[PDB]
Amino acid sequence: DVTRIERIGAHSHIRGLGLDDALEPRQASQGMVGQLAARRAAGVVLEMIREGKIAGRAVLIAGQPGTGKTAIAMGMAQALGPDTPFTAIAGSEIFSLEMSKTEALTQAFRRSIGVRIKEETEIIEGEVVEIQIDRSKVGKLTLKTTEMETIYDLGTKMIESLTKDKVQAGDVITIDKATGKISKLGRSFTRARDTKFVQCPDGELQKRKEVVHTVSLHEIDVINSRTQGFLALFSGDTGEIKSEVREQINAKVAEWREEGKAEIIPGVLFIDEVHMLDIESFSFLNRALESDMAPVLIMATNRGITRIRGTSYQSPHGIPIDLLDRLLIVSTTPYSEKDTKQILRIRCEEEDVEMSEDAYTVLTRIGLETSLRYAIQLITAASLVCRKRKGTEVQVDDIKRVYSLFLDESRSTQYMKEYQDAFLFN
Amino acid sequence: DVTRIERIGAHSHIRGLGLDDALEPRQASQGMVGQLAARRAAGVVLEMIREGKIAGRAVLIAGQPGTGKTAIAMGMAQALGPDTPFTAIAGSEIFSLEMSKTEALTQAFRRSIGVRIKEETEIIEGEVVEIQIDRPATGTGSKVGKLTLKTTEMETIYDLGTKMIESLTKDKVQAGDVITIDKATGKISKLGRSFTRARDYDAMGSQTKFVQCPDGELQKRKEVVHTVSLHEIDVINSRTQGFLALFSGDTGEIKSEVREQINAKVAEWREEGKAEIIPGVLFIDEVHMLDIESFSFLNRALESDMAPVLIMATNRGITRIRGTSYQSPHGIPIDLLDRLLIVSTTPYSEKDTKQILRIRCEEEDVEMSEDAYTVLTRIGLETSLRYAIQLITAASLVCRKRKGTEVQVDDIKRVYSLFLDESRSTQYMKEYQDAFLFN
Amino acid sequence: PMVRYCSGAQGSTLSFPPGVPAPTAVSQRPSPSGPP
Amino acid sequence: KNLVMQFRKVCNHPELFERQETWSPFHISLKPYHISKFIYRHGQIRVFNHSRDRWLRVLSPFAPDYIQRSLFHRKGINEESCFSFLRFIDISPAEMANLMLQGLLARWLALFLSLKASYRLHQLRSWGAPEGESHQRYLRNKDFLLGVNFPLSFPNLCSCPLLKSLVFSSHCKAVSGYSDQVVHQRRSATSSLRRCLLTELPSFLCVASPRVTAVPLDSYCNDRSAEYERRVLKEGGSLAAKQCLLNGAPELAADWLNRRSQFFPEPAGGLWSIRPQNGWSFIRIPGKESLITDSGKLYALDVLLTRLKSQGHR
Amino acid sequence: KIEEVKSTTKTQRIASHSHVKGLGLDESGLAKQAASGLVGQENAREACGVIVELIKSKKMAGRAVLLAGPPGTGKTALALAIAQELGSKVPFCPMVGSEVYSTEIKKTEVLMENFRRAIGLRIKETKEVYEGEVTELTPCETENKTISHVIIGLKTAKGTKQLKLDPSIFESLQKERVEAGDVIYIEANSGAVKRQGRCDTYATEFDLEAEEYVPLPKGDVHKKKEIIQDVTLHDLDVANARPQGGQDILSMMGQLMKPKKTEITDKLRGEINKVVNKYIDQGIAELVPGVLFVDEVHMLDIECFTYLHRALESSIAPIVIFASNRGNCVIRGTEDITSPHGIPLDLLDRVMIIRTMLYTPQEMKQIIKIRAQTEGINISEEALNHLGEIGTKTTLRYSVQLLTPANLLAKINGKDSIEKEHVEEISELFYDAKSSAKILADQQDKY
Amino acid sequence: LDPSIFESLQKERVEAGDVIYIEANSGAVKRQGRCDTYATEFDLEAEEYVPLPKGDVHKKKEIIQDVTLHDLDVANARPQGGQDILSMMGQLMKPKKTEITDKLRGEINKVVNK
Amino acid sequence: NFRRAIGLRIKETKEVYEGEVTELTPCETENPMGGYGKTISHVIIGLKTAKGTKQLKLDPSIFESLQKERVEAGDVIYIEANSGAVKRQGRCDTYATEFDLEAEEYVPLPKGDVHKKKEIIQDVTLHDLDVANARPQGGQDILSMMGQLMKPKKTEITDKLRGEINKVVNK
Numbered sequence A: 001d002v003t004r005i006e007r008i009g010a011h012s013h014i015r016g017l018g019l020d021d022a023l024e025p026r027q028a029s030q031g032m033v034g035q036l037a038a039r040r041a042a043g044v045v046l047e048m049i050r051e052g053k054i055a056g057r058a059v060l061i062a063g064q065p066g067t068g069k070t071a072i073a074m075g076m077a078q079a080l081g082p083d084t085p086f087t088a089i090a091g092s093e094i095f096s097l098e099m100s101k102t103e104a105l106t107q108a109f110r111r112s113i114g115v116r117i118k119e120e121t122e123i124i125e126g127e128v129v130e131i132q133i134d135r136s137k138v139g140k141l142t143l144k145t146t147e148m149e150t151i152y153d154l155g156t157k158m159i160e161s162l163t164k165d166k167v168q169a170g171d172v173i174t175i176d177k178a179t180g181k182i183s184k185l186g187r188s189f190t191r192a193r194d195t196k197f198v199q200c201p202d203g204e205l206q207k208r209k210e211v212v213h214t215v216s217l218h219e220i221d222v223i224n225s226r227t228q229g230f231l232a233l234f235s236g237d238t239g240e241i242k243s244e245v246r247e248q249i250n251a252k253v254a255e256w257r258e259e260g261k262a263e264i265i266p267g268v269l270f271i272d273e274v275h276m277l278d279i280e281s282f283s284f285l286n287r288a289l290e291s292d293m294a295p296v297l298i299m300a301t302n303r304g305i306t307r308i309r310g311t312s313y314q315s316p317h318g319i320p321i322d323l324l325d326r327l328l329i330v331s332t333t334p335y336s337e338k339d340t341k342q343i344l345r346i347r348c349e350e351e352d353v354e355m356s357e358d359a360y361t362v363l364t365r366i367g368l369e370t371s372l373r374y375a376i377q378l379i380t381a382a383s384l385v386c387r388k389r390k391g392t393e394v395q396v397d398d399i400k401r402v403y404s405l406f407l408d409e410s411r412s413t414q415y416m417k418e419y420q421d422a423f424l425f426n
Numbered sequence B: 001d002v003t004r005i006e007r008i009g010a011h012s013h014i015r016g017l018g019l020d021d022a023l024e025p026r027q028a029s030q031g032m033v034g035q036l037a038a039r040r041a042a043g044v045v046l047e048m049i050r051e052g053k054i055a056g057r058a059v060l061i062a063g064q065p066g067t068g069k070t071a072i073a074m075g076m077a078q079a080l081g082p083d084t085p086f087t088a089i090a091g092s093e094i095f096s097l098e099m100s101k102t103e104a105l106t107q108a109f110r111r112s113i114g115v116r117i118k119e120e121t122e123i124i125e126g127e128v129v130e131i132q133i134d135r136p137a138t139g140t141g142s143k144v145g146k147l148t149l150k151t152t153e154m155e156t157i158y159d160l161g162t163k164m165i166e167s168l169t170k171d172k173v174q175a176g177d178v179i180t181i182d183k184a185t186g187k188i189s190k191l192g193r194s195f196t197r198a199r200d201y202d203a204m205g206s207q208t209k210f211v212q213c214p215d216g217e218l219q220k221r222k223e224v225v226h227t228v229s230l231h232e233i234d235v236i237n238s239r240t241q242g243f244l245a246l247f248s249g250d251t252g253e254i255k256s257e258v259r260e261q262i263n264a265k266v267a268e269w270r271e272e273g274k275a276e277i278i279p280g281v282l283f284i285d286e287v288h289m290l291d292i293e294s295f296s297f298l299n300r301a302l303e304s305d306m307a308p309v310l311i312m313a314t315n316r317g318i319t320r321i322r323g324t325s326y327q328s329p330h331g332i333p334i335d336l337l338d339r340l341l342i343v344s345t346t347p348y349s350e351k352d353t354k355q356i357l358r359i360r361c362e363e364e365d366v367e368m369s370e371d372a373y374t375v376l377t378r379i380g381l382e383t384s385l386r387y388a389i390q391l392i393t394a395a396s397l398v399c400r401k402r403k404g405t406e407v408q409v410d411d412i413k414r415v416y417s418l419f420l421d422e423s424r425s426t427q428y429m430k431e432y433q434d435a436f437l438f439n
Numbered sequence C: 001p002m003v004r005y006c007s008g009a010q011g012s013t014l015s016f017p018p019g020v021p022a023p024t025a026v027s028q029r030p031s032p033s034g035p036p
Numbered sequence D: 001k002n003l004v005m006q007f008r009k010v011c012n013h014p015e016l017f018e019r020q021e022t023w024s025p026f027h028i029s030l031k032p033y034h035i036s037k038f039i040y041r042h043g044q045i046r047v048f049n050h051s052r053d054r055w056l057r058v059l060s061p062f063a064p065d066y067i068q069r070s071l072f073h074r075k076g077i078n079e080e081s082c083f084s085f086l087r088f089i090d091i092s093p094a095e096m097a098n099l100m101l102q103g104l105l106a107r108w109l110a111l112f113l114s115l116k117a118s119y120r121l122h123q124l125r126s127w128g129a130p131e132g133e134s135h136q137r138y139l140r141n142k143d144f145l146l147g148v149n150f151p152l153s154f155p156n157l158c159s160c161p162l163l164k165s166l167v168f169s170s171h172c173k174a175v176s177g178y179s180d181q182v183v184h185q186r187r188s189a190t191s192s193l194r195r196c197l198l199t200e201l202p203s204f205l206c207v208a209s210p211r212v213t214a215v216p217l218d219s220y221c222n223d224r225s226a227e228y229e230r231r232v233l234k235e236g237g238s239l240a241a242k243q244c245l246l247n248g249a250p251e252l253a254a255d256w257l258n259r260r261s262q263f264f265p266e267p268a269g270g271l272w273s274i275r276p277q278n279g280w281s282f283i284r285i286p287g288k289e290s291l292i293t294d295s296g297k298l299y300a301l302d303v304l305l306t307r308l309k310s311q312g313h314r
Numbered sequence E: 001k002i003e004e005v006k007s008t009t010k011t012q013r014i015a016s017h018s019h020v021k022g023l024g025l026d027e028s029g030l031a032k033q034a035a036s037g038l039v040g041q042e043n044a045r046e047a048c049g050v051i052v053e054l055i056k057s058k059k060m061a062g063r064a065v066l067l068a069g070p071p072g073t074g075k076t077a078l079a080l081a082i083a084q085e086l087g088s089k090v091p092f093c094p095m096v097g098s099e100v101y102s103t104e105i106k107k108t109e110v111l112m113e114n115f116r117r118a119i120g121l122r123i124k125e126t127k128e129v130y131e132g133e134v135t136e137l138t139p140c141e142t143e144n145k146t147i148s149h150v151i152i153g154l155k156t157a158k159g160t161k162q163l164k165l166d167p168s169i170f171e172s173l174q175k176e177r178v179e180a181g182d183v184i185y186i187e188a189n190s191g192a193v194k195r196q197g198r199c200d201t202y203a204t205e206f207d208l209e210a211e212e213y214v215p216l217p218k219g220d221v222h223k224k225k226e227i228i229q230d231v232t233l234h235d236l237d238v239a240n241a242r243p244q245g246g247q248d249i250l251s252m253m254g255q256l257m258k259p260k261k262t263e264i265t266d267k268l269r270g271e272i273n274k275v276v277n278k279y280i281d282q283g284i285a286e287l288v289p290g291v292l293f294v295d296e297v298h299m300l301d302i303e304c305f306t307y308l309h310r311a312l313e314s315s316i317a318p319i320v321i322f323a324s325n326r327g328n329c330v331i332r333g334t335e336d337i338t339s340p341h342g343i344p345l346d347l348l349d350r351v352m353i354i355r356t357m358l359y360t361p362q363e364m365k366q367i368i369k370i371r372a373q374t375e376g377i378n379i380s381e382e383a384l385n386h387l388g389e390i391g392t393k394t395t396l397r398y399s400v401q402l403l404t405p406a407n408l409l410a411k412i413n414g415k416d417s418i419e420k421e422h423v424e425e426i427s428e429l430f431y432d433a434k435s436s437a438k439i440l441a442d443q444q445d446k447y
Numbered sequence F: 001l002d003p004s005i006f007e008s009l010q011k012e013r014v015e016a017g018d019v020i021y022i023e024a025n026s027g028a029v030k031r032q033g034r035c036d037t038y039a040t041e042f043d044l045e046a047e048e049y050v051p052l053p054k055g056d057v058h059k060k061k062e063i064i065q066d067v068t069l070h071d072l073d074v075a076n077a078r079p080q081g082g083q084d085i086l087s088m089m090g091q092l093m094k095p096k097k098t099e100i101t102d103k104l105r106g107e108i109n110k111v112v113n114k
Numbered sequence G: 001n002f003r004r005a006i007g008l009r010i011k012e013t014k015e016v017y018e019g020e021v022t023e024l025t026p027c028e029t030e031n032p033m034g035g036y037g038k039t040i041s042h043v044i045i046g047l048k049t050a051k052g053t054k055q056l057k058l059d060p061s062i063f064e065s066l067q068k069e070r071v072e073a074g075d076v077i078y079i080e081a082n083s084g085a086v087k088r089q090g091r092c093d094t095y096a097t098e099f100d101l102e103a104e105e106y107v108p109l110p111k112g113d114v115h116k117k118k119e120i121i122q123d124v125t126l127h128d129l130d131v132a133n134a135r136p137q138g139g140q141d142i143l144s145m146m147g148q149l150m151k152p153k154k155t156e157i158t159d160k161l162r163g164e165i166n167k168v169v170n171k
């Protein structure tokens, strides 16, 4: 098989926050296992997003490193699906050199609340059967579906489009009638003799299609900034979008909501590794969560009572009480042996590697002794030792080999003390 | 009488390391004196630079302030000659606002590799006897024309092309101008008018000194050697029409995709015999100014086959590596200090100190009595060498103010009372201690 | 139809073929009035 | 190594086995950025606030009425007001309003005419020294335009021919710097040295190219008037603005259309002022010297033939 | 009768890792004692033997290793061994940790440009092109006049054609100053025109003209060819953010202005990922996910170490190699916190650590030998034994660094090879970090 | 209409039978589509046809606009974009926020008093 | 600041021809050359100043620049004698009464002779030479105009520009 762009990364084995219709988690489903308290808690948050009625509601997924707080946030991102925004960013990702640290949060919030509209559209589609042009200009086009034919006289601004896009008999074309853009689709199978080939369209030639469309609230803020502001969506030129422009676009989107011309679709800002926003950035989150167009804020962190950035002060999670008071904290407790083995099973079943039941047992011991993420990396390496050995399955000696090749941080630190004066700067 | 842009600086008397062909240092030669161990060692690295076989070499010149570290480095810069690139950078100068520290080092590295290109083309060089330019009444509008050219020996007529015509009229060439055309490129260049047309002319359409008509054959070849360094090859390639950025300093942080492409295409120009890549020297003077971020770039920049040789100077003991609290030798992290060879300079004797002052007076066009040299040697041992060096000028100027021909000991005793040594200023600063600010 | 410019050896010359307008017509001072 | 004729072909020249392709960057194009008819109609602040944006312009101090009223209808015998400098720059009240309210096109045209005006100002400023401008008092119009008085200002640098050689690095010549240059004659084989003259860089030194050259990401919209606006953009936004970037000013476009009919035309000013070493496109046609440099035998032959030609041998 | 032989140019320059040609593993993935330029480090080489199969497996994303061990232990040499073991086609992207401190873009985004440069992509790009001598050239007019088409007559050795083309091509022909008799090349996908000068048929037509002349093109006027492009996801990302393709006044001028970097939006990397997935579905593309080597990783900022948590957990990311020469440092940007290798414990889970270790005297002699025969020099066994002793006294790098200086001293002294009398002098001329620190501590009153 | 509104009709590419919105204060003009009585003029033409408006030819409100001294400061400090897109000089110079001088605010105050 | 403290003191001739243009007589040869209708051997330009009137004989190519300008009789004009470029200042003050309004600033008639000469001494620091090479002012290139419409900036001048300036001031 070919390989996608998207391959088997750390959380790629998760395809949903596995839950029952009653928001109770089963022991293992949709890729993820254990965490029955934190999955039930995350299910309630997923229903608050999915319902959308309360603005700026926030949650902190907190726990020891390697206890699934990024995992359940990824399971939630998958279970929320397309069609509702979910902007993941890391805590250090707001620290722009080109744009204010406070604006980069303002911007990230607004990437994650959609404005949805739907618009009626005139589309022609069919195989072009015959096409004629002569000197202004006059001309005549024909189209066929599987179920009808037509002849159309062409106006000047179609002549200067069918000719411009080199349309020929036997092509299949889609025309946005209001604009005259020719979206061609290759050639029909009945003219695959003498490009992709395709069956003719079904139904009638001219369809009043209805198109649903979604634009980020930030993406309306940027289109309004420059002569072709939409390039700054892509190029990153979006520095310091003026707040008196946002103040007008919120006022405009609010009256589109009240008039029913559009609907706002609140998503998630998933700010990972929150403990390293500056206290200035936490002050911005204190007020920015208090507006109609604040999204749901999901925060992740793995720190004890810690000095908060830009200050001498120590506080829980490395977040100021100003912000912890505004949110609900869900606590991810560390795994049992049986959960750890079961995580390792689903990683093996995602990587497509077999291992013996005693291989899973010693790998679980290693996972408990050296904090899990390392045992997940031993699966990947041990199954490559089999492929070099011409073995079909990971046996205990493949794990005990790889465990002697690649160190965890605790054994690496223990082998750093035999050389303590040979390493630099300690 | 006339004074050029370069004048008597701190090192102008140094003209090479003063080594013989068996690489032994002479006691005094090419302006350098004494300092045998470090000059010998610099000879070996100078020979390694000039051999050019190996990349990623670093040398640290170390020792007390005022003991010839910069003298050796600014000395081998002369013995290496002007044809091979030597870049002097103070460690302060990488702290740019147009670009990061690791960019400013990547430029200082690549500005120290030459790509010596010999360019040769046929040139036509003559007095213009006439120009005919023909233009159609309207039509398609293509011009056509002829040029007649003369030397003191020779003459010919050229039926011109279209691109030549627009260059000749753009550059407003006229009969009696002497010109030099690059036949490979269609660029004109103008030397001036031939003398002969003082007789018939208009009211002046141009004015210059005249030039003699060119001699010999009308068509002659020209040879140019360009020592274009890799940094300026990167700048030329960074954007279309980028050439002004070579002077303007405008390009920050040039793409890695450009450099890794130039590293390929310069290797192809070597293998095609199209250009001579010549390794040079980067001299990072006062390198104890580099941040530990910059030193960690030097750990790993210094290992490309496109790295120059580099030389560093420092005058620092065990000190904290700039940007950290970590103490280390020379203020350089051991990651880099392990990766280089350390050339260690030595304090001077009386004999060497006097002999430095003696070659210095010979560069400054000063005469001093042997009594005056004796007192100045004592001053340059009790105080630092740089103070005694400086008193030579002041003593010669005081001597000239009294219309003396030769500096005497009482001119130096005068100047010593007039301009202070640091060690004496720092002593008088104790008796006025409340009057100076922020003690 | 070729108008021609001769940067000649003894002196310059511009030349127009017959029937081309020679559009470099003369310019002269038609006399102004006296006092304002 | 990893039939026999394939080795013989590769010994003779690799062009017999794999012809060097005309390489060119990967030409990616993305789907255009889709803006709905809804956001295009109602969602543009330039449109839905146009009636409010008018009052930002009606209350503007750059309105020529308020410039005139601030400038000439002051109450105090002495009185501070802004726009006082417009009596000493050349600028009219409506020139300042148009330059402020009509954007970067009006900026560009007003610059091109100030370049022209600086040559007229300089030969006044550098020769009109005696007596005075009136009663030996009153500042004249343009008296704040002082940047012409620097010895190195472009009008003075063009007026005095010597300094033009110290300001050597003009914006469209590939000057490397100064070098010595050696000339060789055919007769006698004698040669001579020209000492410190300007050099172009080597004509072959531009050789990098982007691996990928994408089409500018366009916006597509489901609306007839939005289609006309993007068609105006891909044409170039107006006849004036296009001529201004392409030919340098709309005067230089009207002149360039008839530089065909002139003996001594001036330089083009816009993008056509440039001729980059390869042309604007990034394709790398294999130069014919690559025949010599790809074959060891053909390189050996070329040094033999350049010898044998110079010896006069057939 | 006579024989002649010729060569005329310098070699490749020798460099600090140029002896390394691969990991020196056997067919089982065990380390040979001395092979492919490397010696010793058998555990670290066997480990890298798993990692080169990890890269070549393609299945994994954002897996990482940290080579950890004292100065001179070969960590960056082993990442160079991996770079040679993978060959040319899988991209290996070298980086130094202190390169994140850009002045144009955030530290947290320089890493993403490096990550995206390490995912390579091979594209069967069909280019369709017109080339020939321009034998005719005429624009076709239309009301506001505007140009509707251009007609170009093109000629080649194989024939001639007369093509209707878009007014953007005419604007390009005018930009390129194309005229009749010019040899030109046009690619219809880029709309891009290249002039090559007048055809050789015209090389006689003037006595003096600026033109280079070229032979008339061969094959038909209109033809199409594959370019098998090698490209990287960064090279797709950047090329859209400041676009130099197309032919309009804007793209023609983004090609002139200062080439500033920019904080590429996550949305553009999204729409690029969709476009390369479509080229893989069409069979036009092969992805080759490669390696990012962050050497000196111990001085990424803590901003960057915490960004690596999101980057190493991406489903897209390349495999990553870190290296650190450091003990229990302070972590940069924290002032308080100390941790192994200078790397946060939070990141130190996400890496398979490869311990790299100090050398025996025997391994130093053997590296110094393999190094001497790479620098191109002959050395006597008593002198090489003396450099082995200097290795035990000082460090492997100083002992290696004496070789070329000793060879210069030998050829000055007229010998063909390094004798012990040469090394014993070079050891007196050039101090090392340890011996210089003695005199610099004794004389500490005067520095 | 004044000639400047007619230039705006001509920039909107308006012809007889188009459905237009004119605002008499702002001088704003928008073409909304061809009137659908002409929707048979060709069988396909690249235009959108809108039904003849089911509303008054002429509408009035006394609107009451809100604007702030910072809207005035910003919209008068830098040269305006000046054109309704319909330009490409405005592609080159990206905007930035800028240190509006206290001397401009003096004139904005003196104008708002007027 | 180190490069500001070093001055050239560089000296040259300024020469200019200027005045109210009282005639522009394209002056013909007695007969055309073979195959031609007419030939102009020179233009005669009738410059006047408050000291007097004098005709200047000029190269025929000057007319193909006087009609790139808008020069007409009663303008005041100048010609750079070292360069042959002709430039128009405006209608002479003598004509300021001939309409109640006309759209040009009328220019006062020059004084001194039609042909002006002086030697002048111009003093520039080497930093003026650094700046004028680092950011050219010669306007008619797209990058000169873009560089002049963009915000001015100080820029980190290379040691190479210092080298090249030193290599020419030594000349």
Ligand SMILES: Nc1ncnc2c1ncn2[C@@H]1O[C@H](COP(=O)(O)OP(=O)(O)O)[C@@H](O)[C@H]1O
Residues within 6 Å of the ligand: A010, A011, A013, A031, A032, A033, A034, A035, A064, A065, A066, A067, A068, A069, A070, A071, A072, A300, A302, A343, A347, A373, A376
């Ligand atoms: N409940 C879970 N089910 C499956 N995998 C999990 C679970 N919890 C943690 N993991 C594993 O966690 C690894 C990444 O670390 P994670 O626990 O998400 O870090 P953290 O909690 O500190 O954010 C992933 O490889 C993932 O497989």
Ligand SMILES: Nc1ncnc2c1ncn2[C@@H]1O[C@H](COP(=O)(O)OP(=O)(O)O)[C@@H](O)[C@H]1O
Residues within 6 Å of the ligand: B010, B011, B014, B031, B032, B033, B034, B035, B064, B065, B066, B067, B068, B069, B070, B071, B072, B313, B315, B356, B385, B386, B389
């Ligand atoms: N060996 C030397 N030969 C000649 N001049 C020397 C020598 N050593 C020092 N000097 C002179 O002494 C002064 C200071 O020495 P220098 O090398 O510049 O100081 P530092 O060692 O601190 O870098 C300079 O004028 C230099 O020329």
Ligand SMILES: Nc1ncnc2c1ncn2[C@@H]1O[C@H](COP(=O)(O)OP(=O)(O)O)[C@@H](O)[C@H]1O
Residues within 6 Å of the ligand: E016, E017, E020, E037, E038, E039, E040, E041, E070, E071, E072, E073, E074, E075, E076, E077, E078, E325, E367, E396, E397, E400
């Ligand atoms: N095992 C080895 N085999 C061969 N050469 C080695 C080996 N280990 C180190 N080297 C060489 O010795 C020097 C020091 O190794 P290096 O990789 O630079 O150390 P470090 O990991 O500290 O950066 C380099 O020249 C390197 O190529």
